[PDB]
Amino acid sequence: AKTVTKQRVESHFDLELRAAVMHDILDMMPEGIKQNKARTILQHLSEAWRCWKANIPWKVPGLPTPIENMILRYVKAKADWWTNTAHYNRERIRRGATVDKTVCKKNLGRLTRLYLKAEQERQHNYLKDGPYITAEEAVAVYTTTVHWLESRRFSPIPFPPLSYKHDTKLLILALERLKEAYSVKSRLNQSQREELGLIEQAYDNPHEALSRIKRHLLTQRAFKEVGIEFMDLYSHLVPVYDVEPLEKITDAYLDQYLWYEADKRRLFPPWIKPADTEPPPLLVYKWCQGINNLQDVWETSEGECNVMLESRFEKMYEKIDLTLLNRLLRLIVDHNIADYMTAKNNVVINYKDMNHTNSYGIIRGLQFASFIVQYYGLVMDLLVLGLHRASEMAGPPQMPNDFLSFQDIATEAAHPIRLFCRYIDRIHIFFRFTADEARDLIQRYLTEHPDPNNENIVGYNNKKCWPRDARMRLMKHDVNLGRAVFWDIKNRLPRSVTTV
Amino acid sequence: VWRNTEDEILKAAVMKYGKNQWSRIASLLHRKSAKQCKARWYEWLDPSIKKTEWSREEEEKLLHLAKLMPTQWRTIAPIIGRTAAQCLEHYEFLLDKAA
Amino acid sequence: KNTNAETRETLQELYKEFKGDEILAATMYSTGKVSASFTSTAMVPETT
């Protein structure tokens, strides 16, 4: 009579689940007089569980209702147990209680299945509840992008020519980037051996390659399927996408090409900032040193207020929309390349045995997805700043500005938004208000979201890492300005595009 | 690529083993892997994929969608019942016949 | 939305020339919708 300890917990749960079933109906709601096929109702029950886990709609065509209700009830019992165990262990792992090495792997597998069930549902809901972005928001976004590009005098990016001069440089860079994955040359596998073979043969004959590439880019719009899996960082997981080596090469090249041309034609204005000119410790220096050089920035004499707000765009890679994104890419590139990119984001995504089809967001594991994310983020910089201030920051197209510079002091001081940097999808804005700008902002804030009960002070979150001598001090005017500024910035962004 | 002999060895293997044991079927094949096996079956050798001519309503629906949801062939295809490569070739083919 | 002439004239011509749709208009024991929608998130949940 041995206890149930830690290694017999799952085995024991199933002994008792399937005992309970056999008690429950297959011998207390029979009237299948013969020999009640309990051995087969149990087989349904185990296949109902496999189908729940794989997200397959399990329906056995003719099967009496009492039996179907019994099976559905017990699969839901097992699913509640399985999911609550996943929650529990993920907290333990996140804070640090287990070092057990089979729990780490069981739990990564459990949360991968749960993520893919949530995701297939979210794609179905797209195709059912329809494009979430209206036909008024989509048109405002399109027209505003056209006005930007036309005032910049952009010059759209053309199809990689036939006798282009740089293509072997661009392809050599592609392939160097790809070999960096297999730097160590481990036991890799069949599939990595085959990818290395492709890289070497296209390293030897660089024109069979470029012929193949430009053929793909010209004719293909239905691609293979990509596999997914997660990288566990103990505090959250990261998706990791696995694309087929042929298309990996065509995308590596397209990546390099688009970035070279975009930067030569000056597509991305200077506030889009993982830029090649400095490392992140240098951006922090330049931001501090840009604030400090604003004009009369530290004076409070007449009652000004500086506000530094910084947030995140909160789901851009996942409510990108492939039709609006196709058209917005077409404003910029050759309709062939726009179509290749947009049709390459719509593939079948596959984990152990679950498959679904991407239709709504973006696969971030493609190689041009840097380009797509930064272009979309440019469009949303425009919705946040407006075309007038964004054109004052980016300066006249014949004479651009540098990171946080303006042309004169009149233009710099002609507006509250003095600095703006957008790391990939992180947003840091710096406002400088006069006394009456601040008073009117707070007026229109309170008018809509009235706080008579002084509860604005409660939600405010500061940094409990400096001493209270150095934290933020929540006076009424201060926390109300903070909230008004946030309320005013979060209103510029439709909720079907991104939010804050 | 693929040759009559291998295609038929595949057919036989699958029809015996079942349509989710890709690794053993791969093992039967010399120089073929389970990715390729699975792809080949689900696009060309599955018998629910139909190689016939397009009904006129199939085609008018085809063009309607390819205008609604441009370049999303994996999303379009199941809404009319051919694979996305078929849908794609036939859409360019209608576009060019009317070219 | 009074943003520009492109948007004003767009919505004019859209609410003018745009009329209802056809293909996707049409295309949007027991039976088994319960079991289906329960072991599949990619369906609308029936509970009966």
Binding site: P30, E31, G32, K37, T40, I41, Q43, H44, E47, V60, P61, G62, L63, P64, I67, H124, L127, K128, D129, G130, P131, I133, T134, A135, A138, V139, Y142, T323, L324, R327 | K67, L68, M69, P70, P78, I79 | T10, L11, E13, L14, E17, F18, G20, D21, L24, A25, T27, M28
Partner: peptide, 23 residues
Amino acid sequence: WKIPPCIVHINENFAKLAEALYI
């Protein structure tokens, strides 16, 4: 009581979106 042995929707605002964009 005999037991057998175990072994798309599209909204219509897609259209009004796409054509509003073409216009």
